[PDB]
Amino acid sequence: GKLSLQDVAELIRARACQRVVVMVGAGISTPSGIPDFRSPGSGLYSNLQQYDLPYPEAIFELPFFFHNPKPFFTLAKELYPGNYKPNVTHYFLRLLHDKGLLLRLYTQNIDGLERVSGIPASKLVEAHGTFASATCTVCQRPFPGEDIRADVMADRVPRCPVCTGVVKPDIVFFGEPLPQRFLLHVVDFPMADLLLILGTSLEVEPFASLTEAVRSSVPRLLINRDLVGPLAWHPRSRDVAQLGDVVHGVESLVELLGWTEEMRDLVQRETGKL
Amino acid sequence: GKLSLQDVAELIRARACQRVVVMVGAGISTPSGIPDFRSPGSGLYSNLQQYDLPYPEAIFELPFFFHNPKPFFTLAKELYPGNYKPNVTHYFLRLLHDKGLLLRLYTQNIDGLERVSGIPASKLVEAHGTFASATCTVCQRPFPGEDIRADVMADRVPRCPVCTGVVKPDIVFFGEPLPQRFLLHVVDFPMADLLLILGTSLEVEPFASLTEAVRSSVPRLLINRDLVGPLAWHPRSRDVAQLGDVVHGVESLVELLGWTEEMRDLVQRETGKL
Amino acid sequence: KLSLQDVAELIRARACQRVVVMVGAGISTPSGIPDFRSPGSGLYSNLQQYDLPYPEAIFELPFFFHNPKPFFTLAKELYPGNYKPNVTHYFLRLLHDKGLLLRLYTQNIDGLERVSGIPASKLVEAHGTFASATCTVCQRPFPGEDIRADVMADRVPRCPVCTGVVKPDIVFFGEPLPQRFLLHVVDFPMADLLLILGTSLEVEPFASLTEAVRSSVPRLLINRDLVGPLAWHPRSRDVAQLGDVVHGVESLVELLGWTEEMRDLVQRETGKL
Amino acid sequence: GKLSLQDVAELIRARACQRVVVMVGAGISTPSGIPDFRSPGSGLYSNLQQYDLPYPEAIFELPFFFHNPKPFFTLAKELYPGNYKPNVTHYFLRLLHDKGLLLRLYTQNIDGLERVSGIPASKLVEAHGTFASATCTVCQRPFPGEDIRADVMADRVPRCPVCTGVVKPDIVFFGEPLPQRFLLHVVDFPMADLLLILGTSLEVEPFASLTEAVRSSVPRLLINRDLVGPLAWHPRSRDVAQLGDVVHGVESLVELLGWTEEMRDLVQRETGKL
Amino acid sequence: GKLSLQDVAELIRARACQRVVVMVGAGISTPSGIPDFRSPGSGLYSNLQQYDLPYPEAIFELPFFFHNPKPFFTLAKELYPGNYKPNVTHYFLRLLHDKGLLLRLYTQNIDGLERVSGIPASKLVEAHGTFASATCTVCQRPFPGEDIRADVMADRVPRCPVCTGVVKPDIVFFGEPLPQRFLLHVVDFPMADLLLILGTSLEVEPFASLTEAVRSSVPRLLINRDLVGPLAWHPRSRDVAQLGDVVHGVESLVELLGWTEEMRDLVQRETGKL
Amino acid sequence: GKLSLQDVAELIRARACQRVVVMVGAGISTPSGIPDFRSPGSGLYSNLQQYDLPYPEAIFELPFFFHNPKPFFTLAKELYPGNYKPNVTHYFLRLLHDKGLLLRLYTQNIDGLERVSGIPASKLVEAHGTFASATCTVCQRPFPGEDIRADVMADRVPRCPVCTGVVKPDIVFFGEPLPQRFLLHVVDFPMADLLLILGTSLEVEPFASLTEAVRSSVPRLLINRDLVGPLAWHPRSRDVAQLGDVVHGVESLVELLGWTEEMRDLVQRETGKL
Amino acid sequence: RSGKVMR
Amino acid sequence: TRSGKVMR
Amino acid sequence: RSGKVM
Amino acid sequence: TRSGKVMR
Ligand SMILES: *C(=O)[C@@H](N)CC(C)C
Ligand SMILES: *C(=O)[C@@H](N)CC(C)C
Ligand SMILES: *C(=O)[C@@H](N)CC(C)C
Ligand SMILES: *C(=O)[C@@H](N)CC(C)C
Ligand SMILES: [Zn+2]
Ligand SMILES: [Zn+2]
Ligand SMILES: [Zn+2]
Ligand SMILES: [Zn+2]
Ligand SMILES: [Zn+2]
Ligand SMILES: [Zn+2]
């Protein structure tokens, strides 16, 4: 009574699963070349060592930001929309949306590549925020990301046109509440008929517990390097694990679905658009 | 030198007391047949046992609500406007309002029977919230109760027309701040010339302390089963206690006021509209 | 479903010989123990004599260190000697004598379990006791007896060494439960019968202990009401003897066939008091 | 070597310092006759003793305000705009602004004398709030200060025209967040080429750390009664302390700047307008 | 009416007051030459700036101590028994004890001069701890101060003979509970028939509230530079204030008592032993 | 100049380094076959899935322990002394001790292999506790680990001979304070002339900050799979990194030290005793 | 001694 | 140790 | 300002 | 989320 990747594929092709909820992490973005600011070896890391940071995570701490906002904006400059492109996984999720199968996509990433691949914001829950928009720290005025792009690309600290306060990208900092849209989980997970987990161990709350928020009959497909976290600890009969490289597994599923041509077409058009 | 129920009645008839502040609790609504969700023996209690609740009070906890909002909406369905009617006490307060004697009515109840009896919202402080209005958990948009009424009556979880998040009735949950209008006490209690306490022990703060916020010259009339709480612990010279059945005490007071006919007619008309 | 007689017969057959008991205020009101929160008793008035914001403040340390006299008013009223055990206590005692009592968890501070002849080792006094005291300054322990005179003479007991206030080992608000409470970890899995007497079970962590016994273990409730975890999560082998506690206990005693042994015991023990 | 007051004066005259950030406290306003409510001997103190205050600071505590708002409004009545005038220090800061040298002025005072002296609001950070505006405690409606002035001067507790709740001046109470504009420090202190500290030790955070937020090369001039606080514990080479009477020190600096006549003229015009 | 210092003197002379409770602060030790470690001008200060202290109080913080115990032990070396002698205030308190009038002496100082003046430990409540004894930070073994004295005077960090952990003097650090003996106040202040306050404003709790713990009929004599704290805010009819020099005021009280020669005799004898 | 592994070896051979402080983590014990209770695939993991645990870490939580102590004692039975043997790393540390070079060994492990390899308890700091000793949960009586061994191996919950309470191994649970001996770091790290880090990323405080407690002139040698943590973020000139297999790196160091044969003898003798 | 907080 | 973004 | 706790 | 143990 065990399920295969092909079983899930056929479930999707037959539209027995048409309300798919997806949870993704850093694993899906490393094929795009997104540098880990915590890991040594990248130019970002080196550039970050120049400052008086006690540890890397201090970049997402408000006290340090208000002490010195330049490291964070080093990171922002590195990850701002345009510098990096979506890869095959992002476009698979996009195709999932286009065929009317994507209920919601919950992401922990801040590279904003889900948005860049053409998935509408309403299908997204950017749980750690985004660089696509910013808010002034003083007068709370909202700004599109573009409005400060120049300043960010010129290593200048963006100042509000009204009160001259620092304009900060809408990245969620430590201590800050998760975005309001996160609460969509309340309705999304009971409604899901398929749970897709990509490039994340989901060992950190509140995401870990969300894996058990789907109904018991609902298949949970993990495409990850390892089988760890709540899916390893609390397995269900209809769990499917495609262990190994994320890109490889996603491509496998895409083939089993018979979407390869549609996929290459999509990627051609979209890379063409950029 | 003690005051009697009749002394208070005469104070009202001479309108020496024309700024009456009222505090009410669960006691005044049990004659209407409102079920205690905490007590076994009711259909509500039974229905609530169907879920993975550790205890009844968990329906007023936000983590459980976001885990599963269905138990709370079982409660909301039971207590929603229409299912129950006000009794003699509510209409006594209504009559009190009509004769221009009611300064404010502070209620701990969430059955909304004060509103149904025809007391205007401006005269009410619903300290534990209300089903008359709702707020979306995601985008914070306010809605009239009717907007979700249908959903609530069909055991469907109400979702927002704009962002599709859960629309939650404005009931105050544990940990949450009391409603803003509660702060009206700051001006209402020093201004009161009579304090009426009906159907509540008042053992829980911040209500317990409000009984002492009125001036020393102000009579405090308790119509309750027992004499306990701050009025028992800190008695004042002008306190009056009408112990026993609440309905009986209120009817006694109405008779002493000579409002019995106006009352039977008011109940006649209002039950007539319902 | 099981009856009271079924449980009685289970005990008589010694199929249940590791009984764990939980008791509350209900078992002590027939002894005339006054509720300090309720108006109408002399205790309530005497406590009204002081600058208390509310009665419960007698169990708060900041107020105690502000003025320890209200608390010692309570202590004087409830100190060992002033009150006698009733039928429930002596039933629990008899349960101990027949080698059936594993442990008795009590929320009461009247100390009537001890007076009835149940050894300290069989007891878990979850809200503390007047049987022992501790100096608030130098932490020296004292038997309750050592301060009895002072307490009974309306004096605030002071330490013979440093003159700090010697405080009875009653648990105040905010304070940790006594160490012996952790015995529940071993006692409830070992129980073959759970007895709940005279308590609403509204207060944690005491309530949840009712669910710590194995699923096959009968839970017998002798209380006025069926409320708490017993009402919310009922089990197949639960028994509720609702109504007056004394009456229910007496019924069980008859069904056990212990009525005369009980009358004799009460005779001897009341005789010694 | 080590710097003198004249050295700082000359630095300003030489236009080596043209981005001055100023932090002021209660010390600069006592020459205006502003009474210390904490210290016995003032009429304000005497009037405040009328109430059941455990300590003076309780007038800036919300629980006490909602218990009895009258002490606070005694204070508010005393310090409301009009009753007091700016002194030489305030006008020195004004002159600093007029010559285009003032980057920002952070004030701990609530006397609002910085405004009266003619410094534009955009140049001010009133970190402990203001009497220039008020907010209703219930419905959060904003009001100009003028709107409640009459009530405040007539010892009446100002109530909202809409919901009748108490209207409270926008003074920051203990526990409340500092005003948003405080965050301007993030951009103001890295830009400063001179730090001026007047009539405050700046011994309590978050103000204490701000004294170190300026670059190491930036002179810090303290004009205060005593040398205590962060300047005492962590001195920098280019720190200057003008101990003694604040007014005297300011006048000395004004002479050393050669601004004495411009000052006498300015005070003439502005005192003339009042 | 109001009382004078002489009234107190005769109250003592008739021994109608024989249960005197005394509270003292830093002021009474400044005549002994005790350096204020936070204030510049002392050698202790200079020696302490050699370290990475963010603020003076960090010398009494456990995290910093376990990061670097050398600053604290610099302080300890400076204040260790022997380096300083008691003055007239201490010996006045001593005489108060010798005539059997002293119930208890509560001190905030850590110089331990109350003991050196010959006051028995049972009469003292050293609320911030003492250098007379130490405790090992690892195995909690107690040690007399002498045991580590050598180590302290040789700038060596004292290590335990058993487990080699740091042996720390019994000074109360920030966050740590006040000593057990503090709880003696519960019995001491209701029993007091005279309250003496020397060289402290008592602005910080719990001492502040302790000033009001004596009965209303009990006289409170303040000998301090200023009249501030709870004594200023909540004055009582039998309060007496000797403002000015602490030493001079004490000398005045001693003369008025007619103990002056007995005092100089005492000082002669006591200085003789050191 | 940068240092090599061979440089460190030569430093040790010359006893220029004879006060070595060592910090180890999970990495050094995986060659011994120690199962990760968090990772699926071991018999321990399987046995732990038997219980109603929400996540693995709950075996180290007191509320769960007091709810059901059996999972923890499953773990204890698995990791109790005897079931596993020390490897080359442990025995290298042992040889380090025998040659009089080991100042202290700080471990995060609870496998107790440091003790089994023959390192005396006084040289150890077991920061997450140990199975070598146990404490009764009720009366706090201490017991040697062996004393409860039988009960632990017979799947019985060990009970105290005095009060019959559960006797719990001295493993530090989440929320509990670190062992007292941890504070030895205060004296150990300033005294170290060599810091050795084996098999740990040192990502968790308070261990992270300890890497910086050694003097700047003191070499820090990392033998680990990766170069991450404070050693990566804040590198020092005399840091050395032996990246790769821990066993391999240790063997390399042993060869460079010329202790290879002594090491072989030691491991043979000690494996011989087991 | 109370303060006012930074958000 | 690690830091969280808080669920409201 | 820090406080030793009562 | 993860849990720690406290330095006292
Ligand atoms: C919070 O943890 C975010 N901002 C960090 C990214 C690495 C996801
Ligand atoms: C806050 O601490 C303010 N409101 C106090 C004034 C004296 C500035
Ligand atoms: C605690 O606050 C002590 N260490 C301070 C003294 C200087 C009184
Ligand atoms: C704390 O984290 C300890 N108890 C866990 C070990 C398995 C390292
Ligand atoms: Zn702005
Ligand atoms: Zn919405
Ligand atoms: Zn004692
Ligand atoms: Zn309003
Ligand atoms: Zn030691
Ligand atoms: Zn034990």
Chain D nearest-CA distance from G1, in A, is: 9
Q: Smallest Cβ distance to C186: which of F139, F140, F164? A: F164
Residue of E128, E176, E178 to mutate, ligand 3, most atoms within 8 A of C-beta: E128
Cβ proximity of D194 and D21 under 8 Å: yes
Distance of CA B7 to the CA centre of its chain: 26
| CB-based contact G2 D57, cutoff 8 Å | yes
C36 has binding-site annotation:
yes
| Dihedral sign of CA atoms A57, A58, A59, A63 in order | positive
Rounded CA-CA distance F23/F124 in Å is 10
Which amino acid appears at position C7 of this protein?
V
Contacting residues for H4 by C-beta, under 8 A, at least 6 apart: A174, A175, A205, J1
Ligand nearest to the CA of F172: 4
Cα angle E183, E187, E191; round to 5: 145
| CB-based contact C39 B230, cutoff 8 Å | no
Query: What kind and span of H or E run contains D51?
Result: none
How was this one solved? X-ray
Q: Please give the sequence-ordered ranges of beta strands (E in DSSP) within B61-193, or none if there are none.
A: 102-107, 124-126, 129-136, 142-144, 167-171
| CB-based contact J3 F175, cutoff 8 Å | yes
Instruction: Pull the structure tokens for residue B24.
Output: 């009410």
Residue of D60, D126, D130 to mutate, ligand 2, most atoms within 8 A of C-beta: D60
Centroid of ligand 9 to alpha carbon of E140 (angstroms): 6
| Dihedral sign of CA atoms C144, C150, C152, C156 in order | negative
Instruction: Pull the structure tokens for residue B22.
Output: 């009222």
Cβ proximity of C239 and C221 under 8 Å: yes
> Which of B36, B24, B26, B43 minimizes the C-alpha distance to B92?
B24
Contacting residues for D154 by C-beta, under 8 A, at least 6 apart: none
Rounded CA-CA distance F76/F157 in Å is 11
Using CB atoms and an 8 Å cut-off, which of residues 166-185 of chain D contact chain G?
172-178, 180, 182
Distance of CA D195 to the CA centre of its chain: 15
Question: Residue ranges of E for the binding site for Zn(2+)?
Answer: 136, 139, 160, 163
Neighbours of D211 (CB within 10 A): 22
State the resolution, in angstroms: 2.7
Q: Is F185 a catalytic residue?
A: no
Instruction: Pull the structure tokens for residue D247.
Output: 């007014």
Q: Which of A128, A185, A234, A248 is catalytic?
A: A128
Cβ proximity of C80 and C101 under 8 Å: no
Neighbours of D156 (CB within 10 A): 11
Rounded CA-CA distance A22/A92 in Å is 11
Contacting residues for D149 by C-beta, under 8 A, at least 6 apart: D80
Cα angle B219, B225, B226; round to 5: 70
Tell me which chain F residue has its CA closest to the CA of residue C181: F138
Rounded CA-CA distance B107/B131 in Å is 14
- Burial of C227 from C-beta contacts in 10 A (0-12 / 13-18 / 19+): middle
Q: Smallest Cβ distance to A233: which of F56, F228, F230? A: F56
**Distance linking the first and last C-alpha atoms of chain B:** 45
SS3 E168: strand
SS3 B266: helix
Chain J residues within an 8 Å CB radius of H4: 1
Q: Classify each residue of F70-100 as buried b or exposed e, where b means 16 or more C-beta atoms within 10 Å of its C-beta.
A: ebbbbbbbbbbbeebebbbbbbbbbbbbeee
Cβ proximity of E23 and E200 under 8 Å: yes
Chain A residues within an 8 Å CB radius of J3: none
Q: Strand B20-24 to strand A129-136: parallel, antiparallel, or no bridges (unpaired)?
A: unpaired
> What one-character-per-residue DSSP string does chain C give?
---HHHHHHHHHTTS---EEEEE-GGGTGGGTPPPTTSTTSHHHHHHHTS--SSGGGGG-HHHHHH--HHHHHHHHHHSTTSS---HHHHHHHHHHHTT-EEEEEE---S-HHHHTT--GGGEEETTEEEEEEEETTT--EEETHHHHHHHHTT---B-TTT-PBEEEEEPPTTSPPPGGGGGHHHHHHH-SEEEEES----STTTGGGGGSS-TTS-EEEEESS--THHHHS--TTEEEEES-HHHHHHHHHHHHT-HHHHHHHHHHHHHH-
Using CB atoms and an 8 Å cut-off, which of residues 139-198 of chain D contact chain E?
none
Mutate to test the interface with D, among B21, B186, B209 (most CBs of D within 10 A): B186
Contacting residues for D25 by C-beta, under 8 A, at least 6 apart: D107, D108, D109, D198, D199, D200, D201, D202
Rounded CA-CA distance C192/C219 in Å is 9
Instruction: Pull the structure tokens for residue F147.
Output: 């004393």
Rounded CA-CA distance F271/F15 in Å is 28
Chain C nearest-CA distance from E184, in A, is: 5
Cβ proximity of E211 and E23 under 8 Å: yes
Residue nearest to atom 1 of ligand 2 (CA): D128
Centroid of ligand 1 to alpha carbon of F57 (angstroms): 23
Rounded CA-CA distance G7/G4 in Å is 10
Centroid of ligand 1 to alpha carbon of A110 (angstroms): 7
Domains of chain E: 1-30+87-127+180-274 (3.40.50.1220), 31-86+128-179 (3.30.1600.10)
Centroid of ligand 4 to alpha carbon of F24 (angstroms): 13
| CB-based contact F180 E67, cutoff 8 Å | no
Residue keyed to tokens 């009986």: B248
Rounded CA-CA distance F41/E121 in Å is 64
Query: What kind and span of H or E run contains D240?
Result: strand D239-243
| CB-based contact F40 A230, cutoff 8 Å | no
**Helices and strands (DSSP H and E) totals, chain J:** 0, 0
Cβ proximity of C226 and B40 under 8 Å: yes
Contacting residues for B273 by C-beta, under 8 A, at least 6 apart: none
The H-assigned helical ranges of D154-219 are 185-191, 207-210
Contacting residues for D162 by C-beta, under 8 A, at least 6 apart: D136, D139, D141
Distance of CA A249 to the CA centre of its chain: 18
**Which residues of B are part of the catalytic machinery?**
128
SS3 E37: coil
Centroid of ligand 7 to alpha carbon of E184 (angstroms): 9
Chain F residues within an 8 Å CB radius of A49: 233
Chain D residues within an 8 Å CB radius of E230: 55
Q: Smallest Cβ distance to I6: which of E173, E175, E206? A: E206
Q: Smallest Cβ distance to E233: which of D55, D227, D230? A: D55
Chain F nearest-CA distance from C182, in A, is: 6
Angle, helices E146-153 vs E70-79, to 10°: value is 110
Residue of D108, D131, D173, D200 to mutate, ligand 2, most atoms within 8 A of C-beta: D108
